[PDB]
Design a protein around this nucleic acid. Structure first.
Ligand SMILES: [Zn+2]
Ligand SMILES: [Zn+2]
Ligand SMILES: [Zn+2]
Lengths: 26, 53
DNA sequence: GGTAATATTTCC
DNA sequence: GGAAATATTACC
């Protein structure tokens, strides 16, 4: 899980999952 | 399109719908050999097994 | 912390 | 291709 959300610190296996997730913070 | 008859939800495939229908039937075919907890999916039983360590 | 459920991806 | 596995999410 190399992809880290710089808002909430969650790690993600792929950059797509991180991108998807970052929307939840909008 | 693989819709559930009991609730409106659709699923990407027939097996996905099968897995979902277990939420209506209470079918839980995956049973932990350590404590006996039953699961609708093998993936969830798998994750649960790491809680025993 | 660990379920319950499902979206996404992987795998024959 | 669709079953199966995996990753993630929503809950609390
Ligand atoms: Zn985040
Ligand atoms: Zn249903
Ligand atoms: Zn167990």
């Amino acid at each position: 899980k190399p992809f880290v959300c710089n808002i909430c610190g969650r790690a993600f296996t792929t950059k797509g999952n991180l991108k998807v997730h970052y929307m939840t913070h909008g | 399109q693989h819709g559930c008859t009991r609730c409106g939800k659709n699923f990407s495939s027939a097996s996905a719908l099968q897995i979902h229908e277990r939420t209506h039937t209470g079918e839980k075919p995956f049973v932990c050999n350590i404590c006996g907890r039953a699961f609708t999916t093998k993936g969830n039983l798998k994750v649960h097994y790491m809680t025993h360590g």
